[PDB]
Design an enzyme around this catalytic site. Structure first.
Site, PDB file in Angstrom:
ATOM      1  N   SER A  94       0.859  -1.227   0.000  1.00 54.22           N
ATOM      2  CA  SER A  94       0.000   0.000   0.000  1.00 54.22           C
ATOM      3  C   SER A  94       0.886   1.266   0.000  1.00 54.22           C
ATOM      4  O   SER A  94       1.862   1.343  -0.761  1.00 54.22           O
ATOM      5  CB  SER A  94      -1.027  -0.100   1.180  1.00 54.22           C
ATOM      6  N   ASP A 215      -8.560  -5.866  -6.835  1.00 55.74           N
ATOM      7  CA  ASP A 215      -8.097  -4.999  -5.739  1.00 55.74           C
ATOM      8  C   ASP A 215      -8.961  -3.740  -5.831  1.00 55.74           C
ATOM      9  O   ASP A 215      -8.859  -3.026  -6.819  1.00 55.74           O
ATOM     10  CB  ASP A 215      -6.605  -4.668  -5.909  1.00 55.74           C
ATOM     11  N   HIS A 244      -7.236  -6.699  -1.446  1.00 60.01           N
ATOM     12  CA  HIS A 244      -6.143  -5.739  -1.301  1.00 60.01           C
ATOM     13  C   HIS A 244      -5.099  -6.136  -0.263  1.00 60.01           C
ATOM     14  O   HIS A 244      -4.040  -5.514  -0.221  1.00 60.01           O
ATOM     15  CB  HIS A 244      -6.707  -4.387  -0.914  1.00 60.01           C
TER      16      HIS A 244
END
Length: 263
Positions: A94, A215, A244
């Protein structure tokens, strides 16, 4: 020193090669727990919490300072300098994917390899770039977050985990509840309004771009964008994982691909 304490820096494993595991938005270093046992024998594993993690004393979140990703980069490099690490492999999920890209541009010899998981250089769409989100959508996220944090977490956690893994949803929810809503919003603004597209070509280290199917925060085409614009030798690993947070939802398959990438 107190930096290492502040961000709960932890080093485990019997190897000499250094592997850094850097968590993303909404979690803390515990997100790596189901992956970690696979790396203890061959690596010296460095884990830490971003300053925005709910496990970090929020007194350390200086809203005047953490206004962009650069001071996050500062923290990461100071941890690595304070541990005496000048060569390592780095895994970033991320926002930590982008932090690693920036750190690599500042320190081109420090990283032998970047492994990026669920990474995007830019979430917002424009007439030549698809990020996955309109400004309107994002404004509805921010307003929902602020209007009712708990209701936002409860609806957001399942979309993020994606796959039907209710225990992962609970785990992701708890790390989201440990964060002060205040900080969660401010950090979400930092992340949603970042644009790393212009600096991708300055990276020269090899990048492995780990991209799941479906995602919610990263369209397929953004993994190809990274592959095409990151300056070094890039490989997209199309994970046979939905969602994700593959380190939470399919840790065995993720550990296996990580192992191959690091090989």
């Amino acid at each position: 020193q107190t930096l290492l304490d502040a961000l709960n820096v932890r080093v485990v494993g019997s190897g000499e090669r250094v592997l850094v595991l850097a968590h993303g938005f909404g979690t803390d270093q515990s997100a790596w727990n189901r992956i970690l046992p696979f790396f203890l024998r061959d690596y010296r594993v460095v884990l830490y919490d971003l300053v925005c993690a709910g496990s970090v004393n929020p007194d350390f979140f200086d809203f005047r300072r953490y206004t962009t990703l650069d001071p996050y980069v500062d923290d990461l490099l100071h941890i690595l300098d304070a541990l005496g690490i000048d060569c390592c492999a780095y895994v970033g999920h991320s926002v930590s994917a982008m932090i690693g890209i920036l750190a690599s541009i500042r320190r081109p010899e420090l990283f032998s390899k970047l492994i990026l998981i669920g990474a995007s250089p830019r979430f917002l769409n424009d007439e030549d770039y698809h990020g996955g989100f309109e400004q309107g959508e994002i404004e509805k996220v921010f307003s929902a977050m602020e209007a009712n944090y708990e209701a936002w977490v409860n609806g957001f956690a399942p979309l993020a985990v994606g796959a039907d893994v209710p225990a992962a949803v609970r785990e992701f929810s708890r790390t989201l509840f440990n964060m002060r809503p205040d900080i969660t919003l401010f950090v979400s603004r930092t992340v949603f309004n970042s644009d790393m597209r212009g600096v991708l070509g300055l990276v020269k280290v090899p990048c492995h771009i780990f991209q799941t199917a479906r995602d919610h925060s990263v369209p397929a085409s953004v993994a190809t964008y990274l592959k095409n614009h990151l300056g070094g030798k890039n490989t997209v690993h199309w994970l046979n994982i939905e969602g994700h947070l593959p380190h939470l939802s399919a840790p065995t398959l993720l550990a296996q691909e990580l192992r191959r990438a690091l090989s």
